[PDB]
């Protein structure tokens, strides 16, 4: 049990606070395309956002 | 496979040229003028 | 006036009926169909960034050229799937491309009424524009290379004109058909380029001699593409009413009709094989189809395109067919 | 969603 | 018009060294690979170095590995080559070579005017050094390689040059079955694996020269012995 | 002039209708497919395909 | 006779309008060749609700635009693109608003020829033709005879649909 206590505490407060970062980044970048025009920014997709969300989570695991 | 390797190298270079032109084409808005002629199209293009 | 033409219109129909009563194109009914010819995968060429309308092969079945809306004409080879000439294009609104039989020139045409000619073999490492072709008010619907010097192309102004790349001039003008002309298919004899015009009537023409010797009708809706049988005894015309026909030369009439009950779309491209027994198709259900011209039955169905096809080409030595889908993917099915 | 239904309004970057 | 006049190497001394400058004109430098060739006063041609398009790939010869530096200036359309610690064996006249690599291309199709400087590799051997010829006759030149040049793709790597007396060599046949641009159809070549031959008919006065054969499989670029015609 | 052009053009098809075949067109296509069946590689798979 | 792509840049955004029309062919054969466009601009002459085509002698100048406008919006090709409406020469329309009764174009219309009132009814008559309007938006504008400040509106109009298009794919909307 002791082994996953460190993993459990680290991930729970990393998963919660990483989804908010992706949501804030996605909204800001979409509304930040005023300088650009008629183009779709990269990495903003339902499939890609899940992958980029786990990238920040996996950093804590390492 | 000597000239073939160089051919692949040239293909990679022009692949980037097509890729970089994609953003430039996508960075411009496209609008279509529609309607009967002599209805004010001159005053919106001059 | 029309009164005199009425007798002539009925006279030719009587001759057509006599030929139609002689045979039914199904007398044999024992052509031994091959069956499943489902060629699947192993070619996924990419590189374009917009919609694709044209894809033409070479005489050596080695170099493949495709035109897109991105304004970049790209020459491809199926064997090594590596780009060789990512040359730029002046017109972004293009709808066709051509490849010279000698493998030295390419042609592009679109809504700008310009048929640009580019020389591939130049001692500067970069292609140039041979000259600008003007004289059409419609749109370069389809362009082909009649020879290394003389070429024949279609237009959106119901005018097919032979061209001279040496100086630039319309040697012959064939403005004698009402509908819009959508595509043309040449012949190995280099003398027939029967039209696929919009008014559902294929009109035969003669090179260097302005005249029409036979007109083929019997289609509903519009016609978008047309092919030509290898031996010159017939050709296949693809209509927009999800129907196909095989117009013979000597018979000069429709003998077969290929259409299934469930399918309702249209033909965007059609091309024969080497033998001509198997005929490909251009159905608009995001997939291609093949019809056996011998047993008058569907040989098989192949798919794998996200968007519907727009172009189709068969290599001059066979064993390779390319599909110009609207998505930026070209696949040589084998 | 639950306490005060029947609104269901989301808007874009509307300047007017 | 295509001009590849190169300026650079001249009188030097042991220890001290100096660079080369090959100037391009009439063609796109950025889309071409460039080569350098040495010609000793009493010997044949020799590879120096090579720069690919966009400086994306770098190669050097064994005899100048770690000693010579190659660089190009695409905006200036000029080619450089740094030299350090020149030796006595480096006293030779240099060549500037233009080349391109794609399907159906003609590599080594143009050579510069040239300036005068004062084991695992495939061995190229020509058994014949000189041949007396007469106008209107037929002569065959045989070139052999220590390794078979036939690749799995179905094409071989053979190149032929003719050494005009007093100017740069000109490409005649590439890939042993394709004639270079501007070369008459009279010139032809044949071979299989390692026994390659070149056939000439109706010898003319201008046909006199020295013929060199190269190989391009893998990348040990070496020249042949050279046959005097 | 459109009516005059239409009537003068119509006689070409009537004149060309004289050279008409009843069964040669159907036999020609069938014979060509059978004769060139071995040459066509789409109908019969081959082990030496150039696009593997 | 072909199309003309003009370039003009304002507020750090590059635009490339396509002057398609000179084409006298089927048009439908290349109508689909003008997709992926963020928005379209429709120009309407206000002082044409009375004018009648001399050759047709039965179809009104403005009523002809109604058929063209309905076909453009109702097709399956342009279901994912927005519509921008431009009205030209309001000074003549305002002069003819009372000089020529609004009935000439809208006989059902019986409101005062007062410009403000008439302009309101004709504007609402543009958007009630499309069967589906949930994913279709129309940005009506009045411009001017000289149309000096119309550039600002089209810059704002495309920005509204650029953000809307991005959110549609991302699923945020």
PDB file of C-alpha atoms in Angstrom, chain C residues 1 5 8-9 12 19 22-23 34 37 42-43 78-79 212-215 229-231 233-234 246 248 250-251 273-278 317-321 334, chain F residues 3-4 6-7 9-14 16-17 19-26 28-30 32-34 36-37 39-44 46 49-52:
ATOM      1  CA  UNK C   1     -35.744  24.436 -91.400  1.00  0.00           C
ATOM      2  CA  UNK C   5     -34.553  17.880 -90.412  1.00  0.00           C
ATOM      3  CA  UNK C   8     -33.622  13.101 -91.500  1.00  0.00           C
ATOM      4  CA  UNK C   9     -34.016  12.672 -87.734  1.00  0.00           C
ATOM      5  CA  UNK C  12     -31.344   7.733 -88.952  1.00  0.00           C
ATOM      6  CA  UNK C  19     -28.733  -2.541 -85.990  1.00  0.00           C
ATOM      7  CA  UNK C  22     -29.671  -7.660 -85.046  1.00  0.00           C
ATOM      8  CA  UNK C  23     -27.906  -8.195 -81.702  1.00  0.00           C
ATOM      9  CA  UNK C  34     -13.280 -13.780 -63.153  1.00  0.00           C
ATOM     10  CA  UNK C  37     -10.635  -8.986 -58.163  1.00  0.00           C
ATOM     11  CA  UNK C  42       0.099  -0.845 -50.633  1.00  0.00           C
ATOM     12  CA  UNK C  43      -0.034   2.669 -52.146  1.00  0.00           C
ATOM     13  CA  UNK C  78       4.453   5.056 -57.776  1.00  0.00           C
ATOM     14  CA  UNK C  79       7.535   2.878 -57.248  1.00  0.00           C
ATOM     15  CA  UNK C 212     -19.017  15.497 -87.283  1.00  0.00           C
ATOM     16  CA  UNK C 213     -19.672  12.005 -88.636  1.00  0.00           C
ATOM     17  CA  UNK C 214     -21.798  10.500 -85.840  1.00  0.00           C
ATOM     18  CA  UNK C 215     -23.452  11.673 -82.618  1.00  0.00           C
ATOM     19  CA  UNK C 229     -11.641   1.467 -75.871  1.00  0.00           C
ATOM     20  CA  UNK C 230      -8.041   0.392 -76.634  1.00  0.00           C
ATOM     21  CA  UNK C 231      -8.682  -1.020 -80.123  1.00  0.00           C
ATOM     22  CA  UNK C 233     -14.006  -0.200 -81.894  1.00  0.00           C
ATOM     23  CA  UNK C 234     -15.974   1.424 -79.044  1.00  0.00           C
ATOM     24  CA  UNK C 246     -20.665   1.424 -74.329  1.00  0.00           C
ATOM     25  CA  UNK C 248     -19.525   1.012 -80.492  1.00  0.00           C
ATOM     26  CA  UNK C 250     -19.160   0.459 -86.340  1.00  0.00           C
ATOM     27  CA  UNK C 251     -22.536  -0.061 -84.651  1.00  0.00           C
ATOM     28  CA  UNK C 273      -8.073  -1.734 -68.661  1.00  0.00           C
ATOM     29  CA  UNK C 274      -5.648  -3.270 -71.168  1.00  0.00           C
ATOM     30  CA  UNK C 275      -8.020  -6.027 -72.297  1.00  0.00           C
ATOM     31  CA  UNK C 276     -11.161  -3.934 -71.802  1.00  0.00           C
ATOM     32  CA  UNK C 277     -13.074  -6.765 -70.121  1.00  0.00           C
ATOM     33  CA  UNK C 278     -12.987  -4.933 -66.773  1.00  0.00           C
ATOM     34  CA  UNK C 317       1.037  -1.278 -69.211  1.00  0.00           C
ATOM     35  CA  UNK C 318      -1.587  -2.084 -66.573  1.00  0.00           C
ATOM     36  CA  UNK C 319      -1.116  -3.476 -63.067  1.00  0.00           C
ATOM     37  CA  UNK C 320      -1.715  -0.003 -61.592  1.00  0.00           C
ATOM     38  CA  UNK C 321      -4.815   2.190 -61.259  1.00  0.00           C
ATOM     39  CA  UNK C 334      -2.955  -3.477 -56.388  1.00  0.00           C
TER      40      UNK C 334
ATOM     41  CA  UNK F   3     -31.266  26.104 -89.104  1.00  0.00           C
ATOM     42  CA  UNK F   4     -29.163  25.945 -92.279  1.00  0.00           C
ATOM     43  CA  UNK F   6     -28.285  22.020 -88.583  1.00  0.00           C
ATOM     44  CA  UNK F   7     -29.754  20.589 -91.796  1.00  0.00           C
ATOM     45  CA  UNK F   9     -24.827  18.772 -90.698  1.00  0.00           C
ATOM     46  CA  UNK F  10     -27.583  16.154 -90.358  1.00  0.00           C
ATOM     47  CA  UNK F  11     -26.873  14.549 -93.744  1.00  0.00           C
ATOM     48  CA  UNK F  12     -23.355  13.592 -92.607  1.00  0.00           C
ATOM     49  CA  UNK F  13     -24.744  11.143 -90.042  1.00  0.00           C
ATOM     50  CA  UNK F  14     -27.209   9.772 -92.603  1.00  0.00           C
ATOM     51  CA  UNK F  16     -22.168   7.719 -92.446  1.00  0.00           C
ATOM     52  CA  UNK F  17     -25.024   5.360 -91.524  1.00  0.00           C
ATOM     53  CA  UNK F  19     -21.137   1.945 -93.163  1.00  0.00           C
ATOM     54  CA  UNK F  20     -22.984   0.005 -90.461  1.00  0.00           C
ATOM     55  CA  UNK F  21     -22.242  -3.318 -88.761  1.00  0.00           C
ATOM     56  CA  UNK F  22     -24.802  -5.708 -87.288  1.00  0.00           C
ATOM     57  CA  UNK F  23     -22.666  -8.127 -85.243  1.00  0.00           C
ATOM     58  CA  UNK F  24     -19.013  -7.268 -85.968  1.00  0.00           C
ATOM     59  CA  UNK F  25     -18.892  -4.623 -83.222  1.00  0.00           C
ATOM     60  CA  UNK F  26     -19.940  -7.084 -80.508  1.00  0.00           C
ATOM     61  CA  UNK F  28     -14.627  -7.401 -82.079  1.00  0.00           C
ATOM     62  CA  UNK F  29     -14.730  -6.438 -78.395  1.00  0.00           C
ATOM     63  CA  UNK F  30     -15.184 -10.056 -77.286  1.00  0.00           C
ATOM     64  CA  UNK F  32      -9.998  -8.475 -78.256  1.00  0.00           C
ATOM     65  CA  UNK F  33     -10.642  -9.289 -74.589  1.00  0.00           C
ATOM     66  CA  UNK F  34     -10.008 -13.009 -75.121  1.00  0.00           C
ATOM     67  CA  UNK F  36      -5.408  -9.904 -74.834  1.00  0.00           C
ATOM     68  CA  UNK F  37      -6.537 -11.712 -71.669  1.00  0.00           C
ATOM     69  CA  UNK F  39      -1.523  -9.405 -71.547  1.00  0.00           C
ATOM     70  CA  UNK F  40      -3.885  -7.719 -69.074  1.00  0.00           C
ATOM     71  CA  UNK F  41      -2.523  -8.061 -65.506  1.00  0.00           C
ATOM     72  CA  UNK F  42      -5.572  -6.620 -63.716  1.00  0.00           C
ATOM     73  CA  UNK F  43      -7.788  -9.655 -64.330  1.00  0.00           C
ATOM     74  CA  UNK F  44      -5.139 -12.209 -63.290  1.00  0.00           C
ATOM     75  CA  UNK F  46       0.909 -11.880 -61.089  1.00  0.00           C
ATOM     76  CA  UNK F  49       4.091  -6.973 -59.771  1.00  0.00           C
ATOM     77  CA  UNK F  50       6.028  -3.723 -60.128  1.00  0.00           C
ATOM     78  CA  UNK F  51       4.145  -2.099 -57.203  1.00  0.00           C
ATOM     79  CA  UNK F  52       4.627  -4.360 -54.143  1.00  0.00           C
TER      80      UNK F  52
END
